[PDB]
Amino acid sequence: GMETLELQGAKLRYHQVGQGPVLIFIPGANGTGDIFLPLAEQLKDHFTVVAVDRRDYGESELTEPLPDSASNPDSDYRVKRDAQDIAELAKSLSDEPVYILGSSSGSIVAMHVLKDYPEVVKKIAFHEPPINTFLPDSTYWKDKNDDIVHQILTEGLEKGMKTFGETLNIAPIDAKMMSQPADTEEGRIEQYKRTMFWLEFEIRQYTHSNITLDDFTKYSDKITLLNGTDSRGSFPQDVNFYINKETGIPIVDIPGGHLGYIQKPEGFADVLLNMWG
Amino acid sequence: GPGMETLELQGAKLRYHQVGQGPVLIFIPGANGTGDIFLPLAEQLKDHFTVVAVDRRDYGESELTEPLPDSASNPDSDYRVKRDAQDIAELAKSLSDEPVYILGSSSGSIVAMHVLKDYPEVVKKIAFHEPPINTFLPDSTYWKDKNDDIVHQILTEGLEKGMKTFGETLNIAPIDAKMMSQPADTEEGRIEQYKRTMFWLEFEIRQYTHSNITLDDFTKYSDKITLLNGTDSRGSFPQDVNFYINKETGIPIVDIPGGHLGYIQKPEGFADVLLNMWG
Ligand SMILES: *[B@@](*)([O])C1=[C]C(O[C])=[C]C(O[C])=[C]1
Ligand SMILES: *[B@](*)([O])C1=[C]C(O[C])=[C]C(O[C])=[C]1
């Protein structure tokens, strides 16, 4: 039901209703044009109302991925790309400059449109802009946005793994190693994205996978289970126990913890050479 | 990676370390997802195995060449573990005509279980180091409920309280706060509302509110610019932003019914204002 304007790296989807001069609404944190539709039906007799889903939201869809660096606080890409999106939208719909209204961060997009592509702006309206760069109290509001984001992303995650570990009864040796941050601010944020991906896309899907004891017994001569000598009492040690109890597959003990192949690689290797040839 | 190999498979580019001579031994990483963690171990076995340590396709130096399917966020989707499992089977066949040695740790051992289930033709021997799979356990319900709970807790607890105090800092208006306190009417909407909000916090608010705009950039085009303040969002931080602009540039402010979300809270008074501005 939506219109489409295929751009570089995205199909931009937008509503279009009414008739008369083009007026483009840019959404804020909502990111989608549907929020403007009850306003649009009130305006359609006077303007060709265009309410855009910005490329990263809603019915829009990127066709190549975001640069990994878009994750970075002072990244430039998304906001310039969104502004250029609006410029191409206007140009595609109207030979003449159009009206534009942006709300909240969407009016920041509107500021970049009027900066980079003034030729498509006939009038522009900034509904309650939250930008702080030119404020005289700019560092205050920058630091605060920076701090609330750090707090929301990390603080919830750090407490959760801490209690999760004791629900699993994780050996101190692993828990020591697992929490030590990286030695690089880049190593630490790939480390956050890592654990965050793991929580959402791996642990539930993998630990409730369709594997039965039956499809272990088929190949019992090939399998060894392997328990850490530093991680006894932990949840994965019980899974191995249960498997061996019901199938007979043997449990070879091996130095280290859940991470023993990096904790005690030498002794880890010696056990593997023993079992295998 | 800086010394890594590549196997180009359906959907991704699989990067992996290779060291040593002899029988092929493939190591599958767990939660860290990358094979670099096996390298000191590999140095021990390099005289006896061709050690292959894998960056699984979503991690490290491997790269997807297709989008992850939408349904991979479902907690019951088979997709990722099957794809990893077959990523391994093709890696074996690409490296050896013989069946190979395989070791997986933690959720990497689960991947190895799916290699054995679906492609035992490639497994000479296999080892499961500390598997956390619960499906076949008689207390499987306990452990699956623990996983589902902790994950849902981590993904939401920080967000619920952080946005409450953030709005106190912004002095967000009641009409806006009552609205953004509302949950969507289905789980798919609540989840949608949640992904949107996490994306905005990570990829939008810091970038956009500190992007390169000076008041000079307004001065050129004062004739075109109108600024809009909700009559219902008084003393919220954006109004003070518009108050500063008007103070320093002379560009005027038009009051408009509703608050931060006024165009949908009061779309008839919003519309009426706009028609008098520009019609
Ligand atoms: B291995 O990364 C692992 C250990 C564990 O208990 C200590 C649980 C896991 O999944 C829930 C994974
Ligand atoms: B608008 O969506 C918006 C309002 C606000 O103060 C109430 C701050 C914002 O970002 C910092 C955005």
Q: How far is A70 from chain B (nearest CA, A)?
A: 6
CA pseudo-torsion sign A174, A176, A181, A184: negative
Ranges assigned E (strand) in chain B: 5-9, 12-19, 24-28, 50-54, 63-64, 100-105, 123-129, 225-230, 253-256
CA A254 – ligand 2 centroid, Å: 54
Task: With respect to residue B105, please indicate whether it lies within any of the assigned structural domains.
Answer: yes
Task: With respect to residue A133, please indicate whether it lies within any of the assigned structural domains.
Answer: no
Specify whether the CB–CB gap between A172 and A256 falls below 8 A.
Answer: no
DSSP structure class, residue A152: I
Q: Cβ(A237) to ligand 1 under 6 A?
A: no
Q: Cβ(A29) to ligand 2 under 6 A?
A: yes
Task: With respect to residue A132, please indicate whether it lies within any of the assigned structural domains.
Answer: no
Task: With respect to residue B14, please indicate whether it lies within any of the assigned structural domains.
Answer: yes
CB proximity list for B110: less than 8 A, separation 6 or greater: A206, A207, A209, A211, B81, B104, B131, B132, B133
The Cβ-side half-sphere exposure at A176, using a 13 Å CA radius, reads 10
Hey, are the CB atoms on A226 and B202 less than 8 Å from each other?
no
Angle at A255 between CA A249 and CA A256, to 5 degrees: 110
Report the SS3 class of residue A20: coil
Joined together, the tokens standing for residue B110 give: 């689960």
Hey, are the CB atoms on A276 and B207 less than 8 Å from each other?
no
Q: How far is B75 from chain A (nearest CA, A)?
A: 5
CA pseudo-torsion sign A83, A86, A90, A91: positive
Residues in chain B with CB shorter than 8 Å from the CB of A208 are: 75-76, 133-135, 140, 144, 147
Hey, are the CB atoms on B126 and A222 less than 8 Å from each other?
yes
Task: With respect to residue B101, please indicate whether it lies within any of the assigned structural domains.
Answer: yes
Shared-domain flag, residues A199 and A237? no
Specify whether the CB–CB gap between A197 and B68 falls below 8 A.
Answer: no
Comparing CA positions, the residue from B69, B27, B73 lying closest to residue B50 is: B27
The CA–CA distances, whole Å, from A49 to A25, A34, B49 equal 8, 12, 67
CA B152 – ligand 2 centroid, Å: 26
Task: With respect to residue B271, please indicate whether it lies within any of the assigned structural domains.
Answer: no
Shared-domain flag, residues A232 and A143? no
Residues B97-126, buried b or exposed e (16+ Cβ, 10 A)?
A: eebbbbbbbbbbbbbbbbbbbebeebbbbb
CA A236 – ligand 1 centroid, Å: 6
Q: Would you give the distance in Å from CA B62 to the centre of its chain?
A: 17
Q: How far apart are CA A46 and CA B258, in angstroms?
A: 22
Residues in chain A with CB shorter than 8 Å from the CB of B125 are: 222-224, 276
Residues A94-109, buried b or exposed e (16+ Cβ, 10 A)?
A: beebbbbbbbbbbbbb
Specify whether the CB–CB gap between B50 and B24 falls below 8 A.
Answer: yes
Q: How far apart are CA B18 and CA A83, in angstroms?
A: 46
Closest-approach residue (CA) in chain B for A265: B41
Which helix (H) or strand (E) element contains residue B167?
helix B140-170
Q: Cβ(A173) to ligand 1 under 6 A?
A: no
CA B106 – ligand 1 centroid, Å: 6
Joined together, the tokens standing for residue B36 give: 């670099």
Shared-domain flag, residues A22 and A108? yes
Comparing CA positions, the residue from B60, B112, B55, B104 lying closest to residue B85 is: B112
Specify whether the CB–CB gap between B242 and A181 falls below 8 A.
Answer: no
Joined together, the tokens standing for residue A61 give: 């869809």
Question: Counting Cβ atoms within 10 Å, is residue B8 exposed (0-12), middle (13-18) or buried (19+)?
Answer: exposed
Alpha helix (H) residue ranges in chain A: 37-43, 77-93, 105-116, 138-150, 156-168, 172-179, 185-198, 204-207, 214-217, 235-247, 260-263, 265-275
Q: Cβ(B236) to ligand 2 under 6 A?
A: yes
Residues in chain B with CB shorter than 8 Å from the CB of A232 are: none
Angle at A17 between CA A11 and CA A19, to 5 degrees: 120
Which helix (H) or strand (E) element contains residue B169?
helix B140-170
Strand A223-228 to A251-254 pairing: parallel
Specify whether the CB–CB gap between B227 and A110 falls below 8 A.
Answer: no
**Boundary (domain end) residue, out of A151, A186, A207:** A207
Specify whether the CB–CB gap between B261 and B176 falls below 8 A.
Answer: yes
Of the candidates A65, A73, A167, which has its C-beta nearest B206's C-beta? Answer: A73
Q: Cβ(B155) to ligand 2 under 6 A?
A: no
The secondary structure of B230-279 as a DSSP string is ETT-TT-HHHHHHHHHHHHH---EEEESSSTTHHHHSHHHHHHHHHHHH-
Task: With respect to residue A185, please indicate whether it lies within any of the assigned structural domains.
Answer: yes
Q: How far apart are CA A129 and CA A145, in angstroms?
A: 15
DSSP structure class, residue B118: H
CA pseudo-torsion sign A50, A107, B204, B182: negative
Joined together, the tokens standing for residue A11 give: 């199909």
Shared-domain flag, residues A90 and A26? yes
Ligand with an atom nearest the CA of residue B239 = 2
Chain breaks in chain A (C to N over 2.5 A) after: none
Q: How far apart are CA A219 and CA A222, in angstroms?
A: 6
Q: Cβ(A117) to ligand 1 under 6 A?
A: no
**Boundary (domain end) residue, out of A79, A105, A127:** A127
**Boundary (domain end) residue, out of A157, A178, A207:** A207
The count of other CB atoms within 10 Å of the CB of residue A265 is 20
Strand partners, B229: B255
Shared-domain flag, residues A35 and A149? no
Shared-domain flag, residues A59 and A112? yes
Residue of B233, B237, B263 to test ligand 2 pocket, by largest number of atoms within 8 Å of CB: B237
Query: Among all chains, which residue has been given the structure tokens 């690089």?
Result: A184
Q: Cβ(B237) to ligand 2 under 6 A?
A: yes
Specify whether the CB–CB gap between A162 and B153 falls below 8 A.
Answer: no
Comparing CA positions, the residue from B178, B173, B189, B245 lying closest to residue A30 is: B189
Residue B9 φ/ψ, nearest 5 degrees: -115, 175
The CA–CA distances, whole Å, from B72 to B33, B78, B132, B217 equal 17, 8, 20, 44
The CATH number for B74's domain is 3.40.50.1820
Its domain, for residue B69, covers 5-129
Q: Whose CA is nearest to atom 1 of ligand 1?
A: B106
Report the SS3 class of residue B74: coil
CA A128 – ligand 1 centroid, Å: 47
DSSP structure class, residue A181: -
Q: Would you give the distance in Å from CA B196 to the centre of its chain?
A: 11
Shared-domain flag, residues A200 and A255? no
Header resolution in angstroms? 2.4
Angle at B196 between CA B74 and CA A63, to 5 degrees: 80
Shared-domain flag, residues A55 and A160? no
Query: Among all chains, which residue has been given the structure tokens 């593997």?
Result: A272
CB proximity list for A46: less than 8 A, separation 6 or greater: A18, A20, B275, B279
Q: Would you give the distance in Å from CA B167 to the centre of its chain?
A: 24
The CA–CA distances, whole Å, from A154 to A189, A250, B157, B202 equal 10, 40, 11, 11
Q: Cβ(B173) to ligand 2 under 6 A?
A: no
Joined together, the tokens standing for residue B278 give: 């520009």
Task: With respect to residue B241, please indicate whether it lies within any of the assigned structural domains.
Answer: no
Of the candidates B133, B213, B264, which has its C-beta nearest A207's C-beta? Answer: B133
Q: Count up the domains in chain A and report the number.
A: 3
Strand partners, B53: B17, B27
Specify whether the CB–CB gap between B125 and A181 falls below 8 A.
Answer: no
Comparing CA positions, the residue from A37, A132, A42, A272 lying closest to residue B241 is: A132
Joined together, the tokens standing for residue A154 give: 């990390």
Angle at B195 between CA B190 and CA B199, to 5 degrees: 145
Shared-domain flag, residues A152 and A117? no
Residues B208-231, buried b or exposed e (16+ Cβ, 10 A)?
A: bbbbebeeebbeeeeebbbbbbbb
Shared-domain flag, residues A122 and A187? no
Closest-approach residue (CA) in chain A for B132: A236
Q: Which atom of ligand 1 is nearest to the CA of A206?
A: 10
Q: How far apart are CA A82 and CA A175, in angstroms?
A: 43
Residues in chain A with CB shorter than 8 Å from the CB of B71 are: none
Q: How far apart are CA B41 and CA B53, in angstroms?
A: 10
Using only the alpha carbons of chain A, give its radius of gyration: 28
Joined together, the tokens standing for residue B245 give: 């602009």
Specify whether the CB–CB gap between A170 and A234 falls below 8 A.
Answer: yes
Query: Among all chains, which residue has been given the structure tokens 């009552």?
Result: B178
Of the candidates B117, B120, B241, which has its C-beta nearest A135's C-beta? Answer: B241
Joined together, the tokens standing for residue B265 give: 């809270």
